C-alpha positions as a printed Julia matrix, in Angstrom:
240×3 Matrix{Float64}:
 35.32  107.45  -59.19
 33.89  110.35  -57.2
 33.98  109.45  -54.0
 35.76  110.49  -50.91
 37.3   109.16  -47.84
 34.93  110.66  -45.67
 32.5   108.19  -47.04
 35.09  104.95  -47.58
 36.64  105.51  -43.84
 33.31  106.2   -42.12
 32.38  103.95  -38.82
 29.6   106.54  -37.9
 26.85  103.77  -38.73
 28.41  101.24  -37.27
 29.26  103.01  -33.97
 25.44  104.36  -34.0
 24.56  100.72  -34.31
 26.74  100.03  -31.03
 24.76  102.67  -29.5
 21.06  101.62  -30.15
 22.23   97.76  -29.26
 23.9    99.54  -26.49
 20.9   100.71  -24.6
 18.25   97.99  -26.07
 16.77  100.21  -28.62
 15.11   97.51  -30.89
 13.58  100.0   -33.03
 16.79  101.46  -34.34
 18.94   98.86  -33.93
 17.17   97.69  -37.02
 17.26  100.82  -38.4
 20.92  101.27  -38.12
 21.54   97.97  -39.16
 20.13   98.13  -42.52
 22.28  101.44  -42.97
 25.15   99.75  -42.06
 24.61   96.86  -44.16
 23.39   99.0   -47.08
 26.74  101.39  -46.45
 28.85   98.23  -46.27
 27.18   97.01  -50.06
 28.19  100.63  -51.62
 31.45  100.02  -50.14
 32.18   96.85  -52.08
 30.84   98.0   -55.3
 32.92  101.36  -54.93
 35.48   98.72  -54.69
 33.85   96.71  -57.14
 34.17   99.11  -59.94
 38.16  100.44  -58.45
 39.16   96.73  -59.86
 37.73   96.8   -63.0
 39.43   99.71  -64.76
 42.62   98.66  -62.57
 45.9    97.03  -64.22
 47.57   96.6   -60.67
 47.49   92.72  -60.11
 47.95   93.0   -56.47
 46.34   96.2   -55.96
 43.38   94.67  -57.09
 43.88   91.45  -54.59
 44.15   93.54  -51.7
 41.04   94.92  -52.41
 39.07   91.79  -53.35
 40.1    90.21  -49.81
 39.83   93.45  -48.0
 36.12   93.82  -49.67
 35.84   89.86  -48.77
 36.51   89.67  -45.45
 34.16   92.96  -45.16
 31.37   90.74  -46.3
 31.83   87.79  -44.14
 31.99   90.13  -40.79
 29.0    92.77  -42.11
 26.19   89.86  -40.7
 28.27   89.12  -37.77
 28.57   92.49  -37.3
 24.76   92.98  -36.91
 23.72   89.67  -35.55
 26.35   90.91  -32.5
 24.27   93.79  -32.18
 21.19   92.07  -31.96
 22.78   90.13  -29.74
 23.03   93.24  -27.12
 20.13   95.14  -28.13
 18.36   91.86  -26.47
 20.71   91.49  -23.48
 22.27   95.11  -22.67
 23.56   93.89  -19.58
 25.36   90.41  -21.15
 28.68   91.22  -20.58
 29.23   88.53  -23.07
 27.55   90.24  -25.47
 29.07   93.79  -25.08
 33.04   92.01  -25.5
 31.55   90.51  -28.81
 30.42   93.88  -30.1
 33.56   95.68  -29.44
 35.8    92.86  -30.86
 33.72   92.85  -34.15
 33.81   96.71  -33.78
 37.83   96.24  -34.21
 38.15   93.88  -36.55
 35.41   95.89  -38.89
 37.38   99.04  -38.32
 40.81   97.49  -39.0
 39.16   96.32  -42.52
 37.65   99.23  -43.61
 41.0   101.08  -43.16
 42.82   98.6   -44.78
 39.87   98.63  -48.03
 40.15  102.63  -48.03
 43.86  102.73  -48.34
 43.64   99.88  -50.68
 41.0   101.41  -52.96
 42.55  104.37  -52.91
 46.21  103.2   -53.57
 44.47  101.92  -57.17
 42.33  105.48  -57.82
 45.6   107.56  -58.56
 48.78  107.91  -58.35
 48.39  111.75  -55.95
 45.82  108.96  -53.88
 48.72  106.1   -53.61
 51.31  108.95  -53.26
 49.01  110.48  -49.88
 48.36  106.99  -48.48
 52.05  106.11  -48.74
 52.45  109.71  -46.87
 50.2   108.57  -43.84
 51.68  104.97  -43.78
 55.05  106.11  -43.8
 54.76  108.62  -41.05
 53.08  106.65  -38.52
 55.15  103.76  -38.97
 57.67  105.87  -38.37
 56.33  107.28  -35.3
 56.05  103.49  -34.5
 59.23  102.88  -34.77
 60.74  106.01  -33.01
 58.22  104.41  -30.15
 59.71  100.85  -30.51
 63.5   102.22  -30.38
 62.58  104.47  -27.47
 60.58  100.55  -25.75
 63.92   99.23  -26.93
 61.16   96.48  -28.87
 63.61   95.16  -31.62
 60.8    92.93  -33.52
 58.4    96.54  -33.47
 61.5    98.4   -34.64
 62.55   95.5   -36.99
 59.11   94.71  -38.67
 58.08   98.62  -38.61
 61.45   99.9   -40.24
 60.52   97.07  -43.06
 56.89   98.33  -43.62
 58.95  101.61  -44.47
 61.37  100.1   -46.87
 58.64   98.07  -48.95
 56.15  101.14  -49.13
 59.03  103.78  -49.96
 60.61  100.82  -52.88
 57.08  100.67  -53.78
 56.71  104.65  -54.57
 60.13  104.78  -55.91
 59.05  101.66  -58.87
 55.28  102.78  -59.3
 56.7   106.68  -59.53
 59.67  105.94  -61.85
 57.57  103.14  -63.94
 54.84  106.07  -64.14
 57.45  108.99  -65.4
 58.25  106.23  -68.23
 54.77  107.38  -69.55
 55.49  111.0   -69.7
 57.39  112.96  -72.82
 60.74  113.33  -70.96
 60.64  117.39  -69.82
 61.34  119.42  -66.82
 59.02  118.01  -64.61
 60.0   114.42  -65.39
 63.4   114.94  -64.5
 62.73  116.4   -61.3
 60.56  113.83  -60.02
 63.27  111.67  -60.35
 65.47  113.46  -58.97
 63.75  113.28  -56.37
 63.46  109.15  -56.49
 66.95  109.09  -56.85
 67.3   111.1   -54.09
 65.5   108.99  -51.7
 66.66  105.43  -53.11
 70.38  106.24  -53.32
 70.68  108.45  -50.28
 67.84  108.44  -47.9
 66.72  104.65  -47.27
 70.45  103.66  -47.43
 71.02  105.97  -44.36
 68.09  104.69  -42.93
 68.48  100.91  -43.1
 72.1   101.96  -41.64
 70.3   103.77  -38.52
 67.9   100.44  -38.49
 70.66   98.19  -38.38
 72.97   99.73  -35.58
 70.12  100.4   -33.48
 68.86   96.94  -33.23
 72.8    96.18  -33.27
 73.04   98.22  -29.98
 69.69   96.67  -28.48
 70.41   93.15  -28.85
 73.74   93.49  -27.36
 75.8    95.08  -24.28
 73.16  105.28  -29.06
 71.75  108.21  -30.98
 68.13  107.92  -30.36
 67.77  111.64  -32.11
 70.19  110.32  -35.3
 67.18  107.83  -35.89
 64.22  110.08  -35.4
 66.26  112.04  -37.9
 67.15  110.03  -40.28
 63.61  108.42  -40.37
 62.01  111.52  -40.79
 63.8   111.86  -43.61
 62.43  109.0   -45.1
 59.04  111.17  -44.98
 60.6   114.08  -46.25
 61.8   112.24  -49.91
 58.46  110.82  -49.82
 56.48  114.35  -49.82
 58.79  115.95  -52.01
 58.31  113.15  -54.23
 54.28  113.33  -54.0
 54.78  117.57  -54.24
 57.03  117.47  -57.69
 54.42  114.59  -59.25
 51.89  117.82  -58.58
 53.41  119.62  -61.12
């Protein structure tokens, strides 16, 4: 491997780009644009070489299409940029920029993560961390904007990504000579499969029970933070 987010989850060239376009700086538009371009080619063979030594089938997928679709809007990307390096003032052109600027962004998040999630387990054990969290800050936000499909749809991001650390965790103990620290990383599974997520769903369930019909809004917040808690005292006893 050896590298690190700092270079996967950079924008930095692309929002110098934006810049140069910006204020019709021909000169290093171009200049910016071949960084970009050449930072977007290490970025799909970083990927590139994730895959190979990979056994996760859909791991992998993710990270074909997320490395795909980074292709297809990389010349886009620049020829956008071109496009208001010419015309500054083309209002036109500006929308354009900052609409590839999101969907570019939105993909490069989704190919860190995804690389990552298929370097390690401690790097699929810390994305599940961040995912977790802020979708359940989401949700706390959707309860509180009484937005049942956020709080619906969010609280189900939670329950795939947490049954998808509790199987790749468990499956990845089965490799280890049974011991002290094996059995307390499952403990720790157990504790969040057969305790936490059922509380959870339960808090899910009543609150878009009460919302889509005639409560505790700090039962949720605590029983989803839980749901973070058995996930970092999962990641902390697989440091062991």
């Amino acid at each position: 491997d050896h590298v690190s987010d700092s270079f996967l989850e950079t924008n930095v060239p692309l929002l110098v780009l934006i810049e140069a376009a910006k204020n019709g700086n021909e000169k290093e538009v171009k200049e910016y644009a071949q960084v970009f371009r050449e930072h977007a080619n290490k970025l799909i063979e970083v990927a590139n070489l994730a895959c190979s030594i990979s056994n996760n089938e859909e791991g992998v997928k993710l990270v074909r299409m997320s490395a795909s679709q980074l292709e297809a809007l990389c010349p886009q990307v620049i020829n956008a940029a071109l496009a208001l390096a010419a015309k500054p003032q083309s209002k036109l052109a500006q929308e354009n920029m900052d609409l590839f600027k999101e969907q570019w962004e939105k993909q490069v998040r989704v190919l860190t993560d995804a690389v990552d999630d298929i370097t390690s387990i401690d790097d699929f054990l810390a994305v599940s961390e961040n995912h977790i969290l802020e979708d359940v800050n989401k949700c706390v936000i959707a309860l509180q904007e009484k937005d049942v499909d956020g709080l619906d749809r969010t609280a189900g991001a939670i329950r795939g990504r947490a049954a998808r650390v509790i199987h790749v965790v468990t499956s990845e103990m089965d490799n280890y000579e049974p011991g002290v620290y094996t059995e307390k990383v499952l403990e720790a599974t157990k504790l969040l499969s057969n305790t936490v997520m059922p509380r959870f769903t339960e808090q899910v369930e009543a609150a878009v029970e009460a919302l889509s019909s005639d409560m505790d809004e700090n039962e949720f917040i605590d029983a989803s933070r839980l749901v973070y808690d058995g996930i970092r005292d999962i990641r902390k006893a697989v440091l062991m």
